[PDB]
Amino acid sequence: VNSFSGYLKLTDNVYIKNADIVEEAKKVKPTVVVNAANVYLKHGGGVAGALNKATNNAMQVESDDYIATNGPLKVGGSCVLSGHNLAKHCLHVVGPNVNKGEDIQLLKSAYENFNQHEVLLAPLLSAGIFGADPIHSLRVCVDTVRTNVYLAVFDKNLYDKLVSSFL
Numbered sequence: 001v002n003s004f005s006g007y008l009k010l011t012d013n014v015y016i017k018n019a020d021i022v023e024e025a026k027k028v029k030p031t032v033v034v035n036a037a038n039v040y041l042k043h044g045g046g047v048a049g050a051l052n053k054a055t056n057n058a059m060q061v062e063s064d065d066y067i068a069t070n071g072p073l074k075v076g077g078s079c080v081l082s083g084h085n086l087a088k089h090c091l092h093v094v095g096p097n098v099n100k101g102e103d104i105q106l107l108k109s110a111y112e113n114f115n116q117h118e119v120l121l122a123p124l125l126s127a128g129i130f131g132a133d134p135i136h137s138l139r140v141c142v143d144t145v146r147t148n149v150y151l152a153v154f155d156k157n158l159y160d161k162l163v164s165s166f167l
């Protein structure tokens with residue numbers, strides 16, 4: 001039993017809700033919140049910009065130190081940093097950005113990072129401003145993630161389409 005509430009159950013391990021991931025994290029304080037990161041951990045917009053804003057820019061300050069030490073992430077890769085006031089940890093995961101020409105096949109590699117964590121609150125990787133088809137992202141999620149994932153979909157119209165079209 002966990003404290004996630006109001007989710008529709010898609011499979012044994014994948015759950016979904018129309019919710020603002022920022023407000024969800026603040027309520028649940030999950031062990032892991034996933035950020036839709038880029039390789040530079042520049043949290044300017046989309047999910048990343050919203051999560052960072054909710055931390056009063058502390059996420060960005062921490063991220064800049066991470067990059068200065070370690071260099072950029074790989075597309076498909078991740079790192080674990082603090083969850084600040086939102087979660088114990090933030091798993092920064094880089095899905096391919098179609099608006100940069102990145103290979104959509106890397107979306108599966110991106111979701112594989114979730115399997116290192118027993119339970120996660122997450123957005124759909126590569127959705128929104130990363131330009132991929134969210135229906136495809138949900139399919140890859142269900143077919144790749146084996147741990148317990150609670151997906152927050154900000155857009156109500158999109159949430160309804162994802163549910164109604166789910167096979």
Ligand SMILES: Cc1c[nH]c2ncnc(NCC3(O)CCSCC3)c12
Pocket residue numbers: 019020021022045046047050123124127128134152153154155158
């Ligand atoms: C931008 C943003 C702020 N807070 C959020 N919580 C969750 N998801 C988000 N954007 C990604 C999205 O859910 C992918 C699937 S379709 C709708 C968009 C956001």
Ligand SMILES: [Cl-]
Pocket residue numbers: 045046047127128129130
């Ligand atoms: Cl977005």
